[PDB]
Each structure stands twice: as C-alpha cells, then as structure tokens.
C-alpha cells in the first residue's frame, strides 16, 4: 500500500504515535515520507547485510527476523515480512520500542536528515484528525 499523507497521519494517530515520547504526529508522518515515501512495502538493503523494512524502514539487524542476517536479534519478536503489511500496527508497535531505545527519533536517519528541527506540523496540514 502507498498511503496518502493525511490517510497515514490518521492511521498513525489511531495507533498512538501522536505525541508519543513527545514527538508530535508531523514528526512521524515526515519520517515515513522520507524513509519509505509512504510505501508499506519499501525495502532497502543496508551495507552490513541487514535490510530496512516497511513504512518506517525498521532494521532487521536488531528488530525483526528475516532469516538472512544470521545471529541477529529480533527485538520486536516478529518476522520482517509482517512489517510490510498494508496495515501499520506491527510497524507502529515496533517503532514505539525503537523510539524509546535511547536516541529518540534519531534512530531514523531520514528523520534526522530531513525532519528534525523543521516545521513538522506542516505534514498534517489539511488533515481531518
């Protein structure tokens, strides 16, 4: 699934990302835009042999099992395929663990590079939430 901006904002808000750990909803929508272009099936390989999965580009090195990163952790206790689902619940629940893991949203390099410090409230412009 490729979400619309406000469609994704609504789904994220329903699943509790709005202000989660003090990060307003626009942060999360912005992170998704630049991590995945709102595409639930986005995957990008990392140079170390892990892969980033789904709408929030979660890393299989630590967070999910894809069988392809032998000896890696599965801290969300889910297969990585689940993070490519058209429904975002698994990705959100895992993202909540990631954002609480000591670095806030700095975990997402695209958020750091393109959202951090900007007017992230712009990302929910015109949304009916």
Residue numbers in the entry: 1 to 129
Q: Which sentences did the original study use to describe this structure?
A:
Here, an automated procedure is described to identify the positions of many cryocooled crystals mounted on the same sample holder, to rapidly predict and rank their relative diffraction strengths and to collect partial X-ray diffraction data sets from as many of the crystals as desired. Subsequent hierarchical cluster analysis then allows the best combination of partial data sets, optimizing the quality of the final data set obtained. To demonstrate the general applicability of the workflow described here, we have applied it to various systems and scenarios in which many crystals of the same type are mounted on the same cryocooled sample holder. In all of the cases presented our workflow has yielded data sets that are fit for purpose.
However, our experiments using monoclinic crystals of lysozyme show that the method can also be applied to low-symmetry systems. Prior to mounting, 1 µm 75% glycerol was added to the crystallization drop for cryoprotection. Diffraction data were collected on ESRF beamline ID23-1 using an X-ray beam of 10 µm in diameter with a flux of 3.5 × 1010 photons s−1. However, this is not the result of a combination of low-symmetry crystals lying in preferred orientations in the sample holder. Nevertheless, that the merged data set for monoclinic lysozyme obtained following HCA is somewhat incomplete suggests, for some low-symmetry systems at least, that data collection from samples in two loops with different orientations in the X-ray beam may be required to ensure a fully complete, high-quality data set.
